[PDB]
Scaffold this active site. Structure first.
Site, PDB file in Angstrom:
ATOM      1  N   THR A  16      42.943  80.274 110.714  1.00 29.52           N
ATOM      2  CA  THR A  16      41.775  80.105 109.857  1.00 29.52           C
ATOM      3  C   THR A  16      41.245  81.255 109.169  1.00 29.52           C
ATOM      4  O   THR A  16      40.788  81.104 108.002  1.00 29.52           O
ATOM      5  CB  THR A  16      40.709  79.688 110.876  1.00 29.52           C
ATOM      6  OG1 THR A  16      40.380  80.889 111.521  1.00 29.52           O
ATOM      7  CG2 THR A  16      41.093  78.394 111.558  1.00 29.52           C
ATOM      8  N   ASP A  39      66.566  70.254  94.955  1.00 25.12           N
ATOM      9  CA  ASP A  39      66.625  71.677  94.558  1.00 25.12           C
ATOM     10  C   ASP A  39      68.128  72.021  94.020  1.00 25.12           C
ATOM     11  O   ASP A  39      68.980  70.998  93.517  1.00 25.12           O
ATOM     12  CB  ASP A  39      66.318  72.638  95.741  1.00 25.12           C
ATOM     13  CG  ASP A  39      65.503  73.730  94.645  1.00 25.12           C
ATOM     14  OD1 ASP A  39      64.856  74.536  95.541  1.00 25.12           O
ATOM     15  OD2 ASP A  39      65.838  74.070  93.642  1.00 25.12           O
ATOM     16  N   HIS A  69      67.638  79.106  95.114  1.00 22.60           N
ATOM     17  CA  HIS A  69      66.313  78.555  95.211  1.00 22.60           C
ATOM     18  C   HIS A  69      66.478  77.534  96.399  1.00 22.60           C
ATOM     19  O   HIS A  69      65.413  77.581  97.006  1.00 22.60           O
ATOM     20  CB  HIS A  69      65.799  78.212  93.806  1.00 22.60           C
ATOM     21  CG  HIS A  69      64.491  77.924  93.695  1.00 22.60           C
ATOM     22  ND1 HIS A  69      63.668  77.745  94.561  1.00 22.60           N
ATOM     23  CD2 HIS A  69      63.785  78.316  92.477  1.00 22.60           C
ATOM     24  CE1 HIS A  69      62.300  77.878  94.248  1.00 22.60           C
ATOM     25  NE2 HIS A  69      62.487  78.296  92.940  1.00 22.60           N
ATOM     26  N   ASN A 161      54.026  76.586  87.978  1.00 23.68           N
ATOM     27  CA  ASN A 161      53.687  77.948  87.685  1.00 23.68           C
ATOM     28  C   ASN A 161      53.183  78.233  86.105  1.00 23.68           C
ATOM     29  O   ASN A 161      53.445  79.506  85.840  1.00 23.68           O
ATOM     30  CB  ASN A 161      54.950  78.695  88.051  1.00 23.68           C
ATOM     31  CG  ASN A 161      55.728  78.255  89.169  1.00 23.68           C
ATOM     32  OD1 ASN A 161      56.878  78.338  89.420  1.00 23.68           O
ATOM     33  ND2 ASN A 161      54.930  78.038  90.336  1.00 23.68           N
ATOM     34  N   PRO A 175      49.889  61.172  91.028  1.00 21.17           N
ATOM     35  CA  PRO A 175      48.860  61.335  92.077  1.00 21.17           C
ATOM     36  C   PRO A 175      49.353  60.747  93.319  1.00 21.17           C
ATOM     37  O   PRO A 175      48.579  61.035  94.259  1.00 21.17           O
ATOM     38  CB  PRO A 175      47.501  60.270  91.393  1.00 21.17           C
ATOM     39  CG  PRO A 175      48.485  59.261  90.523  1.00 21.17           C
ATOM     40  CD  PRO A 175      49.529  60.205  90.098  1.00 21.17           C
ATOM     41  N   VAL A 177      51.802  61.225  94.981  1.00 18.71           N
ATOM     42  CA  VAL A 177      52.584  62.291  95.952  1.00 18.71           C
ATOM     43  C   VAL A 177      51.448  63.408  96.361  1.00 18.71           C
ATOM     44  O   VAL A 177      50.537  63.299  96.387  1.00 18.71           O
ATOM     45  CB  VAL A 177      53.673  62.945  95.388  1.00 18.71           C
ATOM     46  CG1 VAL A 177      54.710  61.701  94.773  1.00 18.71           C
ATOM     47  CG2 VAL A 177      53.329  63.870  94.066  1.00 18.71           C
ATOM     48  N   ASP A 200      46.475  68.696  95.568  1.00 15.06           N
ATOM     49  CA  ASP A 200      45.907  67.804  96.829  1.00 15.06           C
ATOM     50  C   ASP A 200      45.814  69.361  97.939  1.00 15.06           C
ATOM     51  O   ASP A 200      44.798  68.948  98.950  1.00 15.06           O
ATOM     52  CB  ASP A 200      46.803  66.906  97.440  1.00 15.06           C
ATOM     53  CG  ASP A 200      47.150  65.899  96.762  1.00 15.06           C
ATOM     54  OD1 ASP A 200      46.235  65.086  96.275  1.00 15.06           O
ATOM     55  OD2 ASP A 200      48.392  65.826  96.011  1.00 15.06           O
ATOM     56  N   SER A 224      56.787  76.663  93.833  1.00 13.40           N
ATOM     57  CA  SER A 224      57.920  76.099  94.421  1.00 13.40           C
ATOM     58  C   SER A 224      58.108  76.618  95.759  1.00 13.40           C
ATOM     59  O   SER A 224      59.013  76.256  96.688  1.00 13.40           O
ATOM     60  CB  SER A 224      59.169  76.438  93.568  1.00 13.40           C
ATOM     61  OG  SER A 224      58.921  77.667  92.746  1.00 13.40           O
ATOM     62  N   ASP A 260      38.225  78.359 101.665  1.00 13.08           N
ATOM     63  CA  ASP A 260      38.960  80.001 101.863  1.00 13.08           C
ATOM     64  C   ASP A 260      39.564  80.720 100.830  1.00 13.08           C
ATOM     65  O   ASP A 260      39.690  81.717 100.923  1.00 13.08           O
ATOM     66  CB  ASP A 260      39.825  79.889 102.991  1.00 13.08           C
ATOM     67  CG  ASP A 260      39.225  80.343 104.352  1.00 13.08           C
ATOM     68  OD1 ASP A 260      38.084  80.188 104.799  1.00 13.08           O
ATOM     69  OD2 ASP A 260      39.992  80.657 105.465  1.00 13.08           O
TER      70      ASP A 260
HETATM   71 CA   LIG Z   1      48.220  63.381  95.626  1.00 14.84          CA
HETATM   72 CA   LIG Z   2      38.207  80.354 107.607  1.00 11.89          CA
END
Ligand SMILES: [Ca+2]
Ligand SMILES: [Ca+2]
Length: 279
Positions: A16, A39, A69, A161, A175, A177, A200, A224, A260
């Protein structure tokens, strides 16, 4: 199970708080799940994969990973030392050439290949696809990822990126995925990471140590790199039976570390992938 001195990304998705160095995980570790790494390919012979990785498809002259990669992201999914789901099966689909680039038509073909090929594999726990690639907006690239998702594969894609809104990038802007943004070891949004409402979840994306071609390892940065964390996390939780491919992205955001991260622009989710493990 506890891996001491794990890469910071593994320890972060098992905690956490930031700043720990131990990755805690259930010892099932994604056993019975499969992750397609779409990839540059996977050096399946790397000792870190222990025989669990293999090439299933290439769209170029060789199935060999000449870039590194794909091997790196595969290693983040489920290599022994650098992988989230250390017992998962890795299937490599080489849609990008040895320079890291690829046609959209080739990437769409690879996504459609996974949707079919998963019916020939043994994945009783579920199927995951890690798309550590991105380009400009494309309605067809978005649709192929939506078809991959609808066919019953947990699709995780990189947010991109560009330090911009991910809605202008594909398949990040699809949306249905799991679009994944990147964070650093101080729980800041990665300076490069795309943002926006289409995101997400966030995962460790800055300075991620994983496998590399030639039996080696190296640390690199990108959304990535955060994508295989979430793809491996989904595989790990599907094996535990807590989620399914249709619901894994929604489940991962529900169990994420909320609030966080810093430098999260308003409107962008403040959720960090978190395996929620309690030893
Ligand atoms: Ca989504
Ligand atoms: Ca926390």
């Amino acid at each position: 199970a506890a891996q001491t001195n794990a890469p910071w990304g593994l320890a972060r998705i098992s905690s956490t708080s930031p700043g720990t160095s131990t990755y805690y995980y259930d010892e099932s570790a994604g056993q019975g799940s499969c992750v397609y790494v779409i990839d540059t390919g996977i050096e399946a012979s790397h000792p870190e994969f222990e025989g669990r990785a293999q090439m299933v498809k290439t769209y170029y002259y060789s199935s060999r990973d000449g870039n590194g990669h794909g091997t790196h992201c595969a290693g983040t999914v489920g290599s022994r030392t650098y992988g989230v789901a250390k017992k998962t099966q890795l299937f490599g689909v080489k849609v990008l050439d040895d320079n890291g680039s690829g046609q959209y038509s080739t990437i769409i073909a690879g996504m459609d290949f996974v949707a079919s090929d998963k019916n020939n594999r043994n994945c009783p726990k579920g199927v995951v696809a890690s798309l550590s690639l991105g380009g400009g907006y494309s309605s067809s690239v978005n649709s192929a990822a939506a078809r991959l998702q609808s066919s019953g594969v947990m699709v995780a894609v990189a947010a991109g990126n560009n330090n911009a809104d991910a809605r202008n990038y594909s398949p990040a802007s699809e949306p249905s995925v799991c679009t994944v943004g990147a964070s650093d070891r101080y729980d800041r949004r990665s300076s490069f990471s795309n943002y926006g409402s289409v995101l997400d979840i966030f995962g460790p994306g800055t300075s991620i140590l994983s496998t590399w071609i030639g039996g080696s390892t190296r640390s690199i940065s990108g959304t990535s790199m955060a994508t295989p964390h979430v793809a491996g996390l989904a595989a790990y939780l599907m094996t535990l039976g807590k989620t399914t491919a249709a619901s894994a992205c929604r489940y991962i955001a529900d169990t994420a570390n909320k609030g966080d991260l810093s430098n999260i622009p308003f409107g962008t989710v403040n959720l960090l992938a978190y395996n929620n493990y309690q030893a």
